[PDB]
Design a protein around this ligand. Structure first.
Ligand SMILES: Nc1ncnc2c1ncn2[C@@H]1O[C@H](COP(=O)(O)OP(=O)(O)O)[C@@H](O)[C@H]1O
Ligand SMILES: Nc1ncnc2c1ncn2[C@@H]1O[C@H](COP(=O)(O)OP(=O)(O)O)[C@@H](O)[C@H]1O
Lengths: 252, 126
């Protein structure tokens, strides 16, 4: 019935600002690999990324990384709008600011260490008011894009200078820090995490459904195993990904 | 040299002597031709200075390569504390020294605390 065709799913390959699409259908989306693609999420926000094809991806859903998902404010299993946009505009002196409480991890010069190694030949399209995560120095720092010569978004190219601020600015509180735990941080268990996600999806991801239907969802789950197996990780990730309010009742 | 403390062992005892006065300055090599001035009046040493009667690596022997493991374990957290604030990693914050009683575990703890400069606090079991 003319669906949105775009769904949220976990990302298998290590990459940021990259979205995978099912190989069986290329004409539906009318976009093959290596092209800027716009995506509308919720609360009147959109993002731009690059699209590729993955044989393992299910046609129903579109695999996407957690950084882009946080940018859109969508969650796993959600449905959003996709728009193939071959058009893309370069930028001029793309602006970036330190965001959130991430601070004291850099001394003296602070732009050559993190931004330069990542935006060099990456061609990652940056949009106004998005946070992107940079990994380095045994640390992870999320950078906000507050200012940009072109609007609303521009594809970064190796011909635009970078404006230097070096002054961290507190990010809006409703936004979720990417340093928090997620599905990616929880590995080694594989198909138990799938069972817990299926177990917890409807009660938390679709709460109003159970009020209009008479059935009992699982309200008690015993994660058991040797200490250090990530049970607390699983609980925290399920709470964060589903948006549920996580409360910790420590044994002692 | 002027204003240094040197330890003398004898009489089943150890006494640290301060060099407060000296004809040449700032330091002089002692030779068997210089008289010794006699005072015999002990004087309290400056408090910030650490008494050498306190425990150290030398007082802890017989274990060898366990003390090396503990020193490596505790160096960065205590010897280089500011490093961990600028780098995101967790140093060892809990170490269980276990063994037969009288093996010097308290010695190891005190020596590590003194050598690294950390403030040692004793939570006695009973
Ligand atoms: N399967 C795993 N995948 C990724 N990290 C893990 C995993 N298991 C344990 N860890 C790491 O070990 C830490 C301690 O495990 P944790 O889950 O908190 O204790 P417990 O298993 O008793 O609930 C975790 O904070 C996490 O960083
Ligand atoms: N390996 C050792 N090297 C030098 N002295 C030791 C050693 N082990 C024990 N001692 C001496 O025996 C005393 C008692 O040992 P102590 O470490 O205080 O008790 P515990 O092993 O229960 O912690 C120490 O004060 C120390 O003088």
């Amino acid at each position: 019935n003319r669906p949105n065709r775009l769904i949220v799913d976990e990302a298998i390959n290590e990459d940021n600002s990259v979205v995978s699409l099912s190989q069986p259908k290329m004409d539906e989306l009318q976009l093959f690999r290596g092209d800027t693609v716009l995506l509308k999420g919720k609360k009147r926000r959109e993002a731009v990324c690059i699209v590729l094809s993955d044989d393992t991806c299910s046609d129903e859903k579109i695999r996407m990384n957690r950084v882009v998902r946080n940018n859109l404010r969508v969650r796993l299993g959600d449905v959003i709008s996709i728009q193939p946009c071959p058009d893309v505009k370069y930028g001029k002196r793309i602006h970036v600011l330190p965001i959130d409480d991430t601070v004291e991890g850099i001394t003296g010069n602070l732009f050559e260490v993190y931004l330069k190694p990542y935006f060099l030949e990456a061609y990652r399209p940056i949009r106004k008011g998005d946070i992107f995560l940079v990994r380095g120095g045994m640390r992870a720092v999320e950078f906000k894009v507050v200012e940009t010569d072109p609007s609303p978004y521009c594809i970064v190219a190796p011909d635009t200078v970078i404006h230097c601020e070096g002054e961290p600015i507190k990010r809006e509180d409703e936004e979720e820090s990417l340093n928090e735990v997620g599905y990616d941080d929880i590995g080694g268990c594989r198909k138990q995490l799938a069972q817990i996600k299926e177990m917890v999806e409807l009660p938390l991801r679709h709460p109003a459904l159970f009020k209009a239907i008479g059935v009992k969802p699982p309200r008690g789950i015993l994660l058991y195993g040797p200490p250090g197996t990530g049970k607390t990780l699983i609980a925290r990730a399920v709470a964060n990904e589903t948006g549920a309010f996580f409360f910790l009742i420590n044994g002692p």
